Structures are given as structure tokens and as C-alpha cells.
Amino acid sequence: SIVTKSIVNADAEARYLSPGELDRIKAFVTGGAARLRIAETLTGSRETIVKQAGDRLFQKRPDIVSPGGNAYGEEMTATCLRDMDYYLRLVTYGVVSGDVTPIEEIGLVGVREMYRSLGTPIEAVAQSVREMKEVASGLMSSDDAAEASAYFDFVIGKMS
Template sequence: RVRIATALSDSERKIVDEASKKLWKKRPDFISPGGNAYGQRERALCLRDYGWYLRLITYGILAGDKEPIESIGLIGVREMYNSLGVPVPGMAEAIRCLKEASLALLNQEDAKEAAPYFDYIAQAMS
């Protein structure tokens, strides 16, 4: 688990960049005028959140348990994003893009170990 968390942490910038490119390609409305990631500041905030969720996933992987993800990052997340006007389904899609970009960097066995942590967050946001 340490090896997986280290690989993800060491590649955070690459993963976030790749995931955001995938997301903007799937959902160009997010970065179009009126979208939640339109403008430099808004886009930077989204990328910050993606990095934060990736770190949260590494905590779960290190612990070998989803409890840290729940207690640190998911309690109240839907309410927070709803109050900010951020589309929660869009965040779930972002997590799926993070998963795809992350797992592409891992070997098959490590990817299989890491995948449920991404799925857990995406499901909680769906």
C-alpha cells in the first residue's frame, strides 16, 4: 500500500493534469462561460480540489480502509458543493477521471488495490 500511495503522491501533478484534460474534453460546458470552472481562479480551485481528493485516496490506501476517506473528506461534501453551486455529478465525473489517470500509472495488481477507493468517493458523490 505504501508503494501505491507513494506512486500516486509522486505523480499528483501529472495525474491532476491528465484527469482535468479528460474531464474538460468530456464536459466542455464546465470551462465554458457560465460553467463552474470558467476562468483562471475557478479552474485553479477545481484543480486544487482534484489534488486534495487524490491525497485523500492515498490516505485510504495507506490505511487499507475507507474510513479515513469518510471521516476526513466525505461528511458534508454534497451539502458543501450544493451550497457553492458546484454540480456534484460533475465532481463524481472528476473523480472517475482521476481514477483513470491514476490507474494508468500503476501495474495491474496495484491498480486493482487502488480502484475501490476512487469508486467509493465517486459513489458517495453520485
């Protein structure tokens, strides 16, 4: 989280937290209510975001569900949706924490290696993440979804 990241940087420099870091922590603490609202909406509608994002992704990149594609078959499609659900949950964790350290640790470091081993298109995964972001932004208010989409954008950029 932001607390851990600031602590790590401060200890790497061998110093207490600077006024900038402390002000960032206090601002995050003050704004945590909106973050919890975002997490509540995402968790409550998570089946809806996953369903609609999977539909849009399959429509936009049908070769994924075509024969020879990675997501071919009912089981492969289910695993596709499962990975989408993991990424939505990680997005929620990052939104709550105010920093994308948990997302990076859980589902971004080595993701290239894992998906290369599994035979999955990382760009297709990023497209799925983008679809989830669009659905969630439609589900939330303008500014709220506006600053919720930052973590979706981080995941998309890190995967693609």
C-alpha cells in the first residue's frame, strides 16, 4: 500500500517520512471513503463486469474463442473469465490501498512469464482488462470511475 511504499522509500533513504510523504498519506486517509465506495461497487457488481467484459472481449477478438485459440472450449472460456475475475479483484485491492503495489505483487510480476508458459495472448488479457474498465466506469459516477480507471490503466499498460 501507500503506507508501505512510503516506509520503504524512507528507510531506503534512511530517514523518517518527509512532509510530502506524510501529506500524501493523510490525503489518502481522508479520501479513503471514495475508495471504499469504489471497492463496494466493484465487488457487488463483479459478476456483471466480468460477464460484460468477457462478452465484449470475445466479440472484439473472436479468434481467442476460435478453434486453435487459447480460450477455445467451455473450460478454456471459464478459465478466461476466472483470470478476469482475479484481475478485477486485484484492481479492487489497488483501489482500496491507494497504490498498485498489491496488484504488482500478486498479478503483475512475472505475468509475462506465466502467460507465455500457458500460451496466452497478453495483449488479449490487456484488452479484457480494458473492457472491464469500461464496464466499471459505466457502472460508477464520472469522477469516481475517472479515478478508479487509473488502476485499470496501470494494469493495461503493464500487460500490454
